[PDB]
Amino acid sequence: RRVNALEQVVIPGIRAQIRFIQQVLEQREREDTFRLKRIKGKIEAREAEEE
Amino acid sequence: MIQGVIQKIAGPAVIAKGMLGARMYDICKVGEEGLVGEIIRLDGDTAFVQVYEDTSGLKVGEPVVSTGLPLAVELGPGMLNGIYDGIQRPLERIREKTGIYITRGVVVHALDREKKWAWTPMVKPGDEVRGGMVLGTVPEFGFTHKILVPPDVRGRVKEVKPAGEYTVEEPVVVLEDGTELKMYHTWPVRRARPVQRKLDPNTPFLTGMRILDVLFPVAMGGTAAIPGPFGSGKTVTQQSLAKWSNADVVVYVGCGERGNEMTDVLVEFPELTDPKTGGPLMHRTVLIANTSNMPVAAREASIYVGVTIAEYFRDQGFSVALMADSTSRWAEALREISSRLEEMPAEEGYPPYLAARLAAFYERAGKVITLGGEEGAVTIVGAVSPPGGDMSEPVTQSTLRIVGAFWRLDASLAFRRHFPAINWNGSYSLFTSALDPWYRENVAEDYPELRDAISELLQREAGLQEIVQLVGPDALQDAERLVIEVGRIIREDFLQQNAYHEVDAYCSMKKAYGIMKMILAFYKEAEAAIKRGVSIDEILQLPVLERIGRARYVSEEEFPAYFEEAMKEIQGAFKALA
Amino acid sequence: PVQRKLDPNTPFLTGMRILDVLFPVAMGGTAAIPGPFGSGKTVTQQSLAKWSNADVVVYVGCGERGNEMTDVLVEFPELTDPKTGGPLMHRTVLIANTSNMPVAAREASIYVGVTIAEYFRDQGFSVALMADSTSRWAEALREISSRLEEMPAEEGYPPYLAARLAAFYERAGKVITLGGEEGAVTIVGAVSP
Amino acid sequence: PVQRKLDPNTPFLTGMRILDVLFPVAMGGTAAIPGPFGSGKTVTQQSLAKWSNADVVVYVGCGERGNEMTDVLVEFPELTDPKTGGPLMHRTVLIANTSNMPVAAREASIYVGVTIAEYFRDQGFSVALMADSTSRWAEALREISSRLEEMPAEEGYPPYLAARLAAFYERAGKVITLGGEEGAVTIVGAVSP
Amino acid sequence: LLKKEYTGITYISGPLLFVENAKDLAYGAIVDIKDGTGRVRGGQVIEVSEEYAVIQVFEETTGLDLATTSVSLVEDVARLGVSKEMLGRRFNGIGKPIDGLPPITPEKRLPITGLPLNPVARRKPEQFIQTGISTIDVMNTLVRGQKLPIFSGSGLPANEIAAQIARQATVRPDLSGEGEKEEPFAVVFAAMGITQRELSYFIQEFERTGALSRSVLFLNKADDPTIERILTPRMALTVAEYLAFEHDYHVLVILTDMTNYCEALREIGAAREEIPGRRGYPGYMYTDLATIYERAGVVEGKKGSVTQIPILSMP
Amino acid sequence: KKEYTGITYISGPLLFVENAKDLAYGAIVDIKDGTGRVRGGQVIEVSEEYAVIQVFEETTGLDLATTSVSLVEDVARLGVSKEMLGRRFNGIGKPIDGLPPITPEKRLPITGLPLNPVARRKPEQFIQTGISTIDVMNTLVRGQKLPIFSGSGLPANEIAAQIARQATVRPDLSGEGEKEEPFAVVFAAMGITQRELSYFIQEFERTGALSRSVLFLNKADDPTIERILTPRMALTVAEYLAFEHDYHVLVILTDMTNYCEALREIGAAREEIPGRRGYPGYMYTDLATIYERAGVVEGKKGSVTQIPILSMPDDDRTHPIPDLTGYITEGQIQLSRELHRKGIYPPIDPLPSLSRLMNNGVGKGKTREDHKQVSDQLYSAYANGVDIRKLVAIIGEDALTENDRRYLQFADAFERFFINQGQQNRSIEESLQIAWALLSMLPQGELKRISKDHIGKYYGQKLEEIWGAP
Numbered sequence A: 001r002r003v004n005a006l007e008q009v010v011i012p013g014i015r016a017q018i019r020f021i022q023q024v025l026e027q028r029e030r031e032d033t034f035r036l037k038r039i040k041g042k043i044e045a046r047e048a049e050e051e
Numbered sequence B: 001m002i003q004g005v006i007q008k009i010a011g012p013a014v015i016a017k018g019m020l021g022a023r024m025y026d027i028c029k030v031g032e033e034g035l036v037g038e039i040i041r042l043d044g045d046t047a048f049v050q051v052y053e054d055t056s057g058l059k060v061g062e063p064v065v066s067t068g069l070p071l072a073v074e075l076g077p078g079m080l081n082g083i084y085d086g087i088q089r090p091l092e093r094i095r096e097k098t099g100i101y102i103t104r105g106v107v108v109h110a111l112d113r114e115k116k117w118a119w120t121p122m123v124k125p126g127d128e129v130r131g132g133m134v135l136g137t138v139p140e141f142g143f144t145h146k147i148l149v150p151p152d153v154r155g156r157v158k159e160v161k162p163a164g165e166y167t168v169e170e171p172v173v174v175l176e177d178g179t180e181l182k183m184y185h186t187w188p189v190r191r192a193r194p195v196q197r198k199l200d201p202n203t204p205f206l207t208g209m210r211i212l213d214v215l216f217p218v219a220m221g222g223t224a225a226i227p228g229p230f231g232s233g234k235t236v237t238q239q240s241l242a243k244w245s246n247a248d249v250v251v252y253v254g255c256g257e258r259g260n261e262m263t264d265v266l267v268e269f270p271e272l273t274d275p276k277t278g279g280p281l282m283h284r285t286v287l288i289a290n291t292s293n294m295p296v297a298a299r300e301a302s303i304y305v306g307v308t309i310a311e312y313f314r315d316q317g318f319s320v321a322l323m324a325d326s327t328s329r330w331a332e333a334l335r336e337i338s339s340r341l342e343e344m345p346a347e348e349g350y351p352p353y354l355a356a357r358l359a360a361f362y363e364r365a366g367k368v369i370t371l372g373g374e375e376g377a378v379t380i381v382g383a384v385s386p387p388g389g390d391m392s393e394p395v396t397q398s399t400l401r402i403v404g405a406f407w408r409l410d411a412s413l414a415f416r417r418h419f420p421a422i423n424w425n426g427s428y429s430l431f432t433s434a435l436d437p438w439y440r441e442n443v444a445e446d447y448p449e450l451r452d453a454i455s456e457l458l459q460r461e462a463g464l465q466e467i468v469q470l471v472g473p474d475a476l477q478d479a480e481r482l483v484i485e486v487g488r489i490i491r492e493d494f495l496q497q498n499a500y501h502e503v504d505a506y507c508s509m510k511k512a513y514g515i516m517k518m519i520l521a522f523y524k525e526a527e528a529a530i531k532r533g534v535s536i537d538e539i540l541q542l543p544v545l546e547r548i549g550r551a552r553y554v555s556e557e558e559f560p561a562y563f564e565e566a567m568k569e570i571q572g573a574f575k576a577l578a
Numbered sequence C, D: 001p002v003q004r005k006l007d008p009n010t011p012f013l014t015g016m017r018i019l020d021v022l023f024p025v026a027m028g029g030t031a032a033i034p035g036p037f038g039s040g041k042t043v044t045q046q047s048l049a050k051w052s053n054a055d056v057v058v059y060v061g062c063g064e065r066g067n068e069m070t071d072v073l074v075e076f077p078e079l080t081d082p083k084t085g086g087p088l089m090h091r092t093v094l095i096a097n098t099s100n101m102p103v104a105a106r107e108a109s110i111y112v113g114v115t116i117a118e119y120f121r122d123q124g125f126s127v128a129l130m131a132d133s134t135s136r137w138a139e140a141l142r143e144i145s146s147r148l149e150e151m152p153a154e155e156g157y158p159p160y161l162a163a164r165l166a167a168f169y170e171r172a173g174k175v176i177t178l179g180g181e182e183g184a185v186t187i188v189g190a191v192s193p
Numbered sequence E: 001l002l003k004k005e006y007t008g009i010t011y012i013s014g015p016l017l018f019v020e021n022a023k024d025l026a027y028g029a030i031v032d033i034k035d036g037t038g039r040v041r042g043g044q045v046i047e048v049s050e051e052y053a054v055i056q057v058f059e060e061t062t063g064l065d066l067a068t069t070s071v072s073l074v075e076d077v078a079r080l081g082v083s084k085e086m087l088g089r090r091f092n093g094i095g096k097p098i099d100g101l102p103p104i105t106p107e108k109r110l111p112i113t114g115l116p117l118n119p120v121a122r123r124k125p126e127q128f129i130q131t132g133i134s135t136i137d138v139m140n141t142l143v144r145g146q147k148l149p150i151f152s153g154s155g156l157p158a159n160e161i162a163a164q165i166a167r168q169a170t171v172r173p174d175l176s177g178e179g180e181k182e183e184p185f186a187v188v189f190a191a192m193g194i195t196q197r198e199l200s201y202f203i204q205e206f207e208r209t210g211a212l213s214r215s216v217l218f219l220n221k222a223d224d225p226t227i228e229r230i231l232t233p234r235m236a237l238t239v240a241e242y243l244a245f246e247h248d249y250h251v252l253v254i255l256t257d258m259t260n261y262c263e264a265l266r267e268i269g270a271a272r273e274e275i276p277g278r279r280g281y282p283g284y285m286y287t288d289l290a291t292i293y294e295r296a297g298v299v300e301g302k303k304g305s306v307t308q309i310p311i312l313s314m315p
Numbered sequence F: 001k002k003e004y005t006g007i008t009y010i011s012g013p014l015l016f017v018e019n020a021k022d023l024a025y026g027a028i029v030d031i032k033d034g035t036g037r038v039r040g041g042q043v044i045e046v047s048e049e050y051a052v053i054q055v056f057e058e059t060t061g062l063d064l065a066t067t068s069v070s071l072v073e074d075v076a077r078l079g080v081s082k083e084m085l086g087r088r089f090n091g092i093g094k095p096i097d098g099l100p101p102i103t104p105e106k107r108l109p110i111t112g113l114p115l116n117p118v119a120r121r122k123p124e125q126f127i128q129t130g131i132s133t134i135d136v137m138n139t140l141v142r143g144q145k146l147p148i149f150s151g152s153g154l155p156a157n158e159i160a161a162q163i164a165r166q167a168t169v170r171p172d173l174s175g176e177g178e179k180e181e182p183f184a185v186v187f188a189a190m191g192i193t194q195r196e197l198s199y200f201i202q203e204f205e206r207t208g209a210l211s212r213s214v215l216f217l218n219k220a221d222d223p224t225i226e227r228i229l230t231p232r233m234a235l236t237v238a239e240y241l242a243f244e245h246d247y248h249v250l251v252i253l254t255d256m257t258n259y260c261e262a263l264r265e266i267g268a269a270r271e272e273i274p275g276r277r278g279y280p281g282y283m284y285t286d287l288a289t290i291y292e293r294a295g296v297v298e299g300k301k302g303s304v305t306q307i308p309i310l311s312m313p314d315d316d317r318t319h320p321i322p323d324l325t326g327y328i329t330e331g332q333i334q335l336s337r338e339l340h341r342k343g344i345y346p347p348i349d350p351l352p353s354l355s356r357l358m359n360n361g362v363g364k365g366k367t368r369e370d371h372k373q374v375s376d377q378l379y380s381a382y383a384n385g386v387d388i389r390k391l392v393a394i395i396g397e398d399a400l401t402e403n404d405r406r407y408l409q410f411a412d413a414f415e416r417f418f419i420n421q422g423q424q425n426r427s428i429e430e431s432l433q434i435a436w437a438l439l440s441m442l443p444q445g446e447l448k449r450i451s452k453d454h455i456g457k458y459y460g461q462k463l464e465e466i467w468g469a470p
């Protein structure tokens, strides 16, 4: 009973939690990349005001 | 062509000015040293050129010259027995003229310009020519290299050179329009070659490996993938496919692997022999080799060159098998290239167009009717290496959506010295239905039913693992111990193979059919004797059982007498002593 | 404008046992009902529209299916309201903006519905307002902010989303109108996470 | 400048059992104590200031509360030096920069503390340097780089943060001074992730 | 009408090119791009201003240059020619035949985007459809005018279920009474990102059954340019709406895989530098998906209907 | 000669100079100010209007009125000779041992050229390191790239010093004995502290190991561009020695994590968009340009062997730095914190360790013929014993069978004697003898992986030899 309980309840919940945390971290990384791209564009556009 | 000068250098990115007229994705020779690169963005009078190699030492004001063509390969005689990099540079001639180091700015040609060939014309003046027709034939090792008109050229024949010795650079046929046709032509590596019509695959790709071509077959022109965690026997299987398959031409592609692994394949291949002819194996193979430190553009474009060469050899009318090794490395190179272009990633840092590229690579396979009116086929087998063995990795997910066969490996069977270590539960094939008429018309009329019966017997063994995991393997009843024993026999004498023995490396379909018949007959007679009542230890001791084990090592032309002898022996022992 | 606001002290009878006994809502309160797809938000809101004791019901179909509005338009004239005995559609006002309509009109529909509900409050009636989805309004705000190229806060949403949501929900409550009468507005908004 | 460096062969006794037994720190070494809020970094560093065997103790309150500096200012004159026998405040130098004080002075506080600690090393003493939090230094650097409009590194910090952190920790060590004497500086730095 | 050409190309990068002096280019129009070799590509205006217009290209931009390239105007609104004789034909997902038959003659030219249906003009879907599958018709019965998707897996037989439903779909006008009449039926089939093997299997099943005589196929292969995957379901729904609401046909629309459509939408959106959503997909994917599924239903005062059965696989 | 004075912008580590189109990209410059100090710089962008220079160290005293810039060298070069054996360098070639600089036989660029894949040959000869868990179970072959994985507190530096101090070739096992083989060690340390520097200097000076070694030592407070340049200089010296004087060099890189962090800082300073987890997108290629300079060349007698050492940031094998190193290198050696906390040095865990080129180096003619089967049997027996030891604590020792207790004794005897060797230097014969002594505690017939000819020759020896001084 203990073996079946572990293999049928405990492991899949931990796997789902791991997947959820990975998705959240990846989304935050993508948002950071977008922000850095925007401010790089701003920096490049600043120098072109008067050449 | 368009000439320009350097305006700004920043790492691999170079901005050139005065390049009005240059075209997108052209190939440019940057600087006085001769470095090459693509054009990725046009802007006013300037052009953004991204150099492949190191740009250290360059200066502002150096000339930039555009070749006027995109990335392409030279297709013609001399590609066989050759070793090439990701952008079709012959490595043997580079070593001969430079040494042990590959210096930047080296200039070589894909085809040797000084070797003479015996030209045999097959046309006369006044003939009409369209794309794909045959101009003439040229002997090359064991083949007749058909000289083909490029697919984009049509017209009328004006003058034909007579039979003699010429190089690839000399025209052999000149059209009335003024077009001069040589022995070779160039084709962009990113654009597919045209065909008359794609056919339906119904003939098997004889791998020679028993489990593959019996349980999970792949047809001619089909596609297959073979993933696996770390060392599971991938390289041995692909080189066994290279040796023992029925493909006329083999194209091996190494996408950015370790240097010692490239050394292994570059040294061991020139010693093997072709089973079809008895000559060297390299007389029918083309090798594309890239190490990890080679430029990322060549590693990214490595697979397209190989698939273009395979399409050319298909267009000549042959049957080609293309082995792409570790497409995950190609995906990593693609990710790096996308990272250098500042693109927003998707999934685990991959570009959002990965599935489109993987579909574009795998869709080129298939059995077609060529433009010259002949049959041809390209078969693709691509190895994948997920990082942790997880099959949810995006490259594996994208590959699984399009492959017709899926051979999954694991090192657990490698622990037990069980080779090939194919998971017979997780693997599957979608070519089983279409290949059955060929099997029944050419191997045996009862091959599919027997194969399904053996698959069911293998399935019945797996369902008892929930009993043997708690109760010991000896405390079972007769009807379960018998199927467990026959499953062990099947695993250790039919789903196991070695390729270092002469009479076992290449397994014909009749041989496998005979072994399967012996196993099924043994199981049926054992079950019938168990019905009559007998001790099961006697079943695990009878001497006829060893003939199943010793049916693997009979010679292929010696097999039928052995099979009949076993079929008459088995009827004797089980009726009297049981 | 209003004169004063009063403490809510009479229940809003919805006709459902679990919502009336265990988790009640008053005559000037606000309620939120979030759930995944197929949970039953729309059925609950339509049952509230059918069976509640409010005098006037204003239903705001912000960014949802068109069949859910046709069902209301067809079945309501054949039903009877609980307190006057007339047709059920004679006390209902529908604001419909389906999912395939222009996106920028989703934001205006909420304000139009809440303004109409406030107008009926000033006459002394008790008005119940049902917003079918506020996440679609949030999506429209995100689209507008993306067109304006503003820096997002979280999940692409503009940083002023909470202020807009608080300004919408604060219009509910039991008041004493400028004419000296008593009125009430209750807001039940559904969230689709 | 110094003359030469020396191997660490003498413990820095802190009076705490787990630190002095299981995880020793030498006289010229460095240590770090990170943890969340309310875990005991400030109490540990104050105990190190009270009970260690250092001749001079320099305490740097980079971006922390003012109540703790008031506690140090009040309690320390009433205590006794373990080895000198006099008041404990006669061997301590405090450098204070609270959280409401201006942001740009935190790096100056860190550098002033480490320079004073280096000065007391040149006279032949063994000095202990306590940094209350080095994360506020990085936060100040991020705040300044926000106005500089630089290209930030990971988590918004400037790219040169690691060089500054390395250059701060390398000043510690057991040296031979220019005058021929022998002194050492030991650095303990708390991190607030 | 006589054509007008622009040569003021000032910037090409990736899938975007900028055209100078493009005042008379309408928003969302369809353009034709020609280069020095005479090859013609497709494109759509996505942003227009006083200084330049921005055009995204339907395929790869190789071979383009700022000297010889010219851009012409095809039409201000993308339209498709439709006719009743399309029953039994095959198309590639852009409107061109692939069975080798001569092209059809357009009865009408309709906008492929469509228009939203007035909620007043709708009516309640109230007719049962017999699918021939027991677990559907009893517990999850399909009503004429419903959009009922199928949530599949990565190794589950969804295509076979769809083919069986398309073979066995009937109207059964006996039990609720209805008209008790022989009623026309049609099936519009659209496939996005399909492979060669599945294409052969689908055409073989349709030919062996005999249901091809009352069907229209919009088949888009996986090697086609990705824009043709985007426009594929819109043309199928345009044809279905035309048939149902101008000829009283009860059409059935089957969409083979929406996952390929979503991945193509993400790839297109990432090339225009837009803020991503939950898993890198664009934030407006709800509206884009809604503009497809909302074109089904029934209309008060008319006899026809549209029923959609999309098939998608859960990763 | 010529000097540029048109400085127009100074901020952080960068400065802009106008009218500097004569400067080649990637060149090395000198920055001189009014106070007489001279700083070095490297050009990272060249344009028609200005050029961008990244400055080594800080930019404290600079100003826009008196600063001047002069070119030094177009391509970064290193002057090499055979006198470098026994010298210490700071990472850019400057001596730091107080000895005068060498006279260069040649000057070579530090950026490498790729080896032609058709010019390499298969590795077939092993290197004796003196550590049993490496020499027997995870044998190191000449021409192999074998990384070592460690944690924050594990003794990686001590292991590196011991391996550099003890390693040698064994020609006497190679056929009839061959002859004298030149051997050398190239030691490159990046981002080390003062304590590690003093420890390394003392260790290499206290036994004469400095007489055959070259040291490239870059400190933690040194400029980061020197940390970038250090491994390329070390590999340039190694390649020159190996392929011009037939040496058998052994390159040890102390911390690749510091190199990766310096690469991240350099990429951030040049305004490049990072890739996964903030690391640069070209980290794979940059790491490949360092690892793939090792190997053995057909037609030559020399070789290059690399032992990279990297610390996993959170003991996570999914971090990009351990992940990318696995794809390029052949195998790994993993240190275990459990064996370290249990008092066992060196704390090498054999179960997660792997060498992928071991089968080409073991066997007769180059070592003893019983190498592979002994290693396999040891691995299997240890794998059984570690699980039996965990089952014991639940079910008790009396509930076991006899072979279970035999394996239980074998596991801890193995851990106590084979691994925990301390500062010993064991030849391959000593390690094989100890391995056969440990296997003798197992009964005959339990050794399934060993042929009976070896069992009839080596079985049955007592363990009390190493017991004299463990």
Ligand SMILES: Nc1ncnc2c1ncn2[C@@H]1O[C@H](COP(=O)(O)OP(=O)(O)OP(=O)(O)O)[C@@H](O)[C@H]1O
Binding pocket: C035, C036, C037, C038, C039, C040, C041, C042, C043, C044, C192
């Ligand atoms: N109170 C109820 N009694 C009976 N059936 C119910 C009830 N609530 C929901 N259902 C059933 O569940 C379904 C849920 O549909 P509904 O439109 O209410 O869901 P939803 O959560 O609003 O969905 P969506 O997010 O897709 O708009 C109903 O169609 C009905 O079949």
Ligand SMILES: Nc1ncnc2c1ncn2[C@@H]1O[C@H](COP(=O)(O)OP(=O)(O)OP(=O)(O)O)[C@@H](O)[C@H]1O
Binding pocket: D035, D036, D037, D038, D039, D040, D041, D042, D043, D044, D192
């Ligand atoms: N060694 C100790 N003995 C007894 N109590 C302790 C000890 N260390 C901490 N505490 C208790 O825990 C509390 C932790 O507060 P403290 O000021 O030490 O936190 P901190 O980790 O320095 O946090 P901050 O990030 O706010 O500076 C103390 O106020 C005290 O009540």
Ligand SMILES: Nc1ncnc2c1ncn2[C@@H]1O[C@H](COP(=O)(O)OP(=O)(O)O)[C@@H](O)[C@H]1O
Binding pocket: B230, B231, B232, B233, B234, B235, B236, B237, B419, B420, B421, B497, B498, B499, B500
């Ligand atoms: N058909 C076979 N016959 C004999 N040996 C095999 C066969 N298949 C696999 N092996 C063994 O499996 C091992 C796997 O080696 P390799 O292919 O290098 O692994 P990988 O390529 O997965 O890292 C080989 O040493 C080989 O001896």
Ligand SMILES: [Mg+2]
Binding pocket: B234, B235
């Ligand atoms: Mg392999």
Ligand SMILES: [Mg+2]
Binding pocket: C041, C042, C064
């Ligand atoms: Mg709803």
Ligand SMILES: [Mg+2]
Binding pocket: D041, D042, D043
């Ligand atoms: Mg505190």
